[PDB]
């Protein structure tokens, strides 16, 4: 059952649907994905395979219905995850258990490759906290929790390989990599804090905040083309454009949306594409990095579209753009917004794009997969 | 009627004619100037004057008279170059 999108009803509250990485790979597009269930009776991690719509060469056709290959119990809820490789998945648990599973495309089962039954406790009272955010950078894995501590693990380690402690408890929302050795997080108050993974100890290494326009920040990602460029989604729906590797003050604050920003991700095979979800259930397609190809309808800032080369025009004096660092108002940083879909189902909480392929999960226990209108 | 069609063409057409008269070629400059003169001799609506005033073409044109001065100062010397510069200044 698909219209412009694979619609899969699994009757399980969808928490995680991430491609067992196949985009930018082989001569075959993604068709294998890993699923993590939340608030379902069997809190579980599954492998699933989706088939191409219609009938193609030697691929046993199929009009739809992606199928589970294997399932395994995950104690507690299943919140955060990253593919350590195609064959290893890293998952957090509410019980303080962080599990890397070695899953198999050969026999279709998951095996407990590694399990940290204990991790991530705030320093000052040594209270346990759940693993709030996770991001893998092979071989390193960087995790944070609402304790405010940071844990750097390796795939094969059983101990906390590196721990950045803190005496100031902070509830974060999302994490990303500034460099190979640098991590950044959003904070539930609109703060972006930086720590050196090679410098350890209590109290945040550095804290920075949105200036003038202040909303709590719920998501962060480094831009693929520029990791120093960082995007953060917030509670209001305001978007901040950053050029940050040591920065403190945002150089673009644009009040875009009026609903909380769950997640926005860069298209990996097209970082000029960005995909955006909202709490109401609506979705948005962005086609721009520092330019404009789509329009935008509620974004702040100045300027739309781009000037063309070749001069056939009256003799004009045109001025270069102003010093954006001299102001704290919505200005350039345009990345466009297109309402390809207003709310259609229950609140969408997770979306992902790998290559020209997109997947997302809703509170309707439904998975929606798209492949066009951006490819 | 044709004045109405001119103004229907509006900014783009007279943009074209202004650029062609300012940087075009001598013969084409004469053609454009004659066209403009006969059109203006019957125009009573002055869209052309308004637009050329708005666009600052007068500014670049008057600043081009500084180049006219220098070229004519060259022309006053013995064995002057060809009369095309004189024709340009005349136009």
């Amino acid at each position: 059952m698909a219209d412009k999108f694979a619609a899969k009803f699994v009757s399980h509250k969808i928490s995680r649907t991430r491609w067992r990485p196949v985009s930018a790979s082989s001569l075959q597009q993604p068709d294998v994905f890993a699923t993590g269930s939340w608030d379902n009776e069997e809190n579980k991690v599954c492998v699933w395979a989706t088939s191409d719509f219609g009938a193609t060469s030697l691929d046993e056709e199929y009009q739809g219905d992606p199928k589970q290959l294997c399932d395994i119990k995950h104690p507690g809820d299943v919140m955060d995850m990253q593919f350590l490789d195609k064959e290893r998945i890293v998952t957090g648990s509410s019980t303080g258990t962080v599990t890397i599973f070695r899953h198999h495309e050969n026999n279709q089962t998951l095996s407990v490759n590694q399990r940290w039954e204990q991790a991530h406790y705030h320093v000052g009272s040594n209270m346990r906290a759940p693993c709030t955010a996770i991001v893998c950078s092979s071989p390193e894995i960087v995790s944070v929790g609402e304790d405010g501590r940071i844990n750097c693990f390796r795939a094969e380690s059983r101990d906390v390989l590196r721990t950045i402690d803190d005496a100031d408890s902070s509830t974060m929302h999302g994490v990303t990599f500034l460099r190979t050795t640098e991590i950044l997080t959003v904070n539930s108050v609109g703060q972006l804090k930086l720590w050196d993974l090679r410098k350890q100890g209590n109290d945040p290494t550095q804290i920075f905040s949105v200036t003038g326009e202040r909303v709590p920040l719920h998501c962060v990602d480094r831009h693929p083309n520029q990791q120093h460029v960082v995007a953060t989604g917030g509670q209001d729906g305001m978007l901040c454009i950053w050029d940050v590797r040591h920065g403190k003050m945002p150089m673009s604050l644009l009040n875009a949306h009026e609903a909380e920003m769950w997640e926005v991700h860069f298209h990996p095979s097209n970082p000029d594409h960005l995909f955006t979800c909202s709490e109401d259930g609506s979705l948005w397609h962005w086609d721009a990095s520092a330019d404009s190809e789509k329009p935008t309808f509620l974004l702040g800032g100045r300027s739309t579209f781009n000037i063309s080369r070749s001069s056939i025009a009256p003799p004009n004096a045109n001025q270069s753009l102003a010093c954006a660092w001299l102001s704290t108002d919505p200005t350039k940083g345009q990345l466009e917004i297109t309402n390809l879909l207003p709310s259609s189902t229950l609140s969408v909480n997770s979306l992902d794009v790998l290559g020209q392929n997109l997947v997302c999960g809703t509170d309707a226990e439904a998975i929606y997969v798209t492949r066009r209108l951006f490819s | 009627d044709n004045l109405s069609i001119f103004e229907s063409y509006g900014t783009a057409l007279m943009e074209v004619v202004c650029r062609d008269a300012c940087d075009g070629h001598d013969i084409g400059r004469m053609l454009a100037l004659a066209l403009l003169d006969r059109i203006v001799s019957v125009d009573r609506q002055q869209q052309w004057l308004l637009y050329l005033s708005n666009s600052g073409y007068l500014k670049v044109l008057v600043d081009s008279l500084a180049e006219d001065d220098v070229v004519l100062r060259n022309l006053l010397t013995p064995q002057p170059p060809l009369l095309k510069a004189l024709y340009i200044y005349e136009s």
């Binding site: 219609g54 009938a55 193609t56 060469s57 030697l58 056709e61 | -």
Partner: protein, 57 residues
């Protein structure tokens, strides 16, 4: 509305049906490519025929 529907239906029916597209193969790879072609043809003919029959009904 009936005339509009008749025109749509008539253009659709006068559209020739989908073709399986096979010419006698001499190599195994040719049979395999035929396999591909019949996959495509079976989807395309099925969808086109379903819409055709909806229209005519």
């Amino acid at each position: 509305e009936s005339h509009e529907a008749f025109n749509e239906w008539f253009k659709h029916i006068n559209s020739p049906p989908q073709k399986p597209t096979l010419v006698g193969q001499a190599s195994f790879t040719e049979k395999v490519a035929h396999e591909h072609k019949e996959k495509k043809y079976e989807m395309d003919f099925g969808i086109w025929k379903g819409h055709l029959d909806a229209l005519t009904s």
